[model samples]
Target: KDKLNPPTPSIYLENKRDAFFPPLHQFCTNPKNPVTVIRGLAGALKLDLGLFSTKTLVEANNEHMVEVRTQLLQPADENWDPTGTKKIWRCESNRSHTTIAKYAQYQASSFQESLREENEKGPFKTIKFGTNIDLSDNKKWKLQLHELTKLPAFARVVSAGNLLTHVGHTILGMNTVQLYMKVPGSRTPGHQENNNFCSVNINIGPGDCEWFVVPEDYWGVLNDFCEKNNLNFLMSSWWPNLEDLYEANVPVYRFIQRPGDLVWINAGTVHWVQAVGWCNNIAWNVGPLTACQYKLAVERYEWNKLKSVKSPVPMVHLSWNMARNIKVSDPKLFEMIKYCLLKILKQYQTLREALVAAGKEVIWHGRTNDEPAHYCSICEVEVFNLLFVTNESNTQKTYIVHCHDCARKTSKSLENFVVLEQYKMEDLIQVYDQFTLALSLS
Candidate 1:
């Protein structure tokens, strides 16, 4: 009972310009406060939900809203029959490119054409669609949602005092901004929970939905919540019922998102959503990182990876790339990045010694030929030492490694481990040396 005093979640309105864009790092790091709401900020779009009623693409080429709903709600394996009777269809596309294209037509500006062109030729354009219809010719919405990425509010949340820059944005795609849709009622399953990116959800018109959110700090309680309900966190498809939450004494915040409202789901926060009636909204993910947020995001990423969950973004890889690009003259940012890198290097050394003692292979997951493609089985960060192998009576030679943090969390004995040489101290020092040299020159 002593640990049950969770902070109340906050809702910030865009009433004042300064209030609308508070420091994201402060809000995100505060344990008691996880979810923040910025309302009435997306009104600039003047989006009309009725625009989606018209059939523009093969997936949405139906006559009525009921038919569209049927197509959207159908089973994932089943195909939609234009002439068939009305039934709910489940959209399998990761995003609705068709709907995004329509909105792109309204939002495109001269400065954004190059970005649109890049997106047109990028992975999004080449994705396999359920329908045989080609989306290549539909350049109308090519990068229509790009404006949302440049919003002043979003810029402030992700910007780290010019240390990092926001790159291009990505739309949810299949659901487009104006389409009536529901996200099939599940927690963003698997590795997606560890996505380092933040999102901006804009609700526009006739339908509404309830968002059930548990702040990042409260994530530890979920283990207890699952155990009490006889559920498995990794394998279960079931979401906890509201009654169950009350019974278990878990803290949850419910937000009713209405039209013309914007909601920000910070990186690392766990949440689930249910759309009521017909609904339409636009959402996008951020592509940049700060030194502070990067540390937390990497830790969460490592945690997710340990569970074999995968994220679309290469967070650690990006972090390294960002480090290489930092100008040395900005000593404050440079020192911060260097400090972080050195800390990681120190941890790697500690793990390597532990691995040697435990008779486990020391492997590193970096951009080198000798490094193996393995991550810390416990933290999900790249493995430097202490490999966890299962020595079951008659099994193949398969093993996973762990960082020191995860090693402490595991209940298994050291005998269930193996030594595999994965990382080289020389290679790590070489990279570190390069950075040091660059700093000196700058």
Candidate 2:
């Protein structure tokens, strides 16, 4: 019952470092946020499902209502103030409604229902974009679209200067940074974005929307129930039934976001959305490659592999890339990440030894530009540097990769398969040691 309120959010507050597990909910308003906030994200303020707003935001984008009033009447009217509702007449406001009927038809027709056409009776969708337009910029003398940019503190958090967004990797395709126009009853089914990246959203609204969040602890329980009930547990195809969830005793938080309000769904929380009214919203994903985040991404990464499901983020591959590219000044972060890198290197060494003893041929197949990482076609595990490729294929591809276990499980002979190494063992060893000296530097 005491969860009725949340601790005030600020990225620059001088709160001493706390725990690592994160708060059930947090709220961040614009302040001196550093890219180093990457380290703080895991330690400072301990967070999950945090809501971030800015003074520049709450009022910055409140370009609705009053301006539409100015549009219909002669441009210079003192009656535009909202408090004096009594001063205006039916003539101007009613004319705007006449046009309202026009645009409703425009959106319903323009975007069309990618929500799957009454499939709430059967199904739904999200990768569908409802036309890229800004809700705030289209008022009066002026009408507009996406005046929103990566300028405000809320949006700039992902700007290039922050170590968070400033790196390049061919880790594959992630459709981050998107905007949507949602109509009443259109919903977003529950999902933690394919990788455990934090989801950032803001209401660019003329209306409000509802959200439901499940913290990390209750995810397995929530996931199992979805499966038990014959629902898609991963990338859930249905919205949660409130009465059923309440009866199950899992804790879920609800939020009502209006114009300029920010809702942050942390990296790895399970959440879903429902449109309460016609509203415009924007969202994107961003989280740094830190030890805490890497561990969870790895946690989910391994689980997806066990379930024989494809993992969207190549977390293991990305770890080596981070080690080869970035350096850390925080001892706490550096210490944990170093140990994790060594653990990975040790596993690689052992896997290489067994393959050599088995007499499998090893060939170097270093990547070109952003060639995405490959997964075992059968088990769905990410095959590291030494890929086991089979020349004989039953499917479309000429060659397919298999993990050693799956290769052995599916075949009687090793004659058809060969191992392709991305980097030579000597080159990788150099990378590992260079990472050590770089982070351990004064």
lDDT tens digits, residue span 1-442, model 1: 4233343355444444434455643564343455666555545433333433222321343221111111123222122333334321212234333333333232233215536877991111111111112222134434334444345534332343321232122222211233333322211221124354555566654456567676566566665665565655544533445455555676767677776666667655667655543344555444333444555566665666666765444444444445555444445545665776777778767766765787655444234432323456554565433345444511563444554556545544445544444446775567666674234552
Model 2, residue pairs in steric clash = 9-27, 22-46, 23-46, 119-122
TM-score of each: 0.52, 0.63
Native-referenced Cα lDDT, model 2: 0.52
Model 1 sits at a Cα RMSD from the real structure of 13.4
- Against the true structure, candidate 1 reaches a TM-score of 0.52
lDDT of each: 0.46, 0.52
Off by over 4 Å in 1: 1-32, 44-140, 147-150, 153-180, 183-192, 227-230, 287-292, 327-340, 343-442
Candidate 1 achieves a global lDDT of 0.46
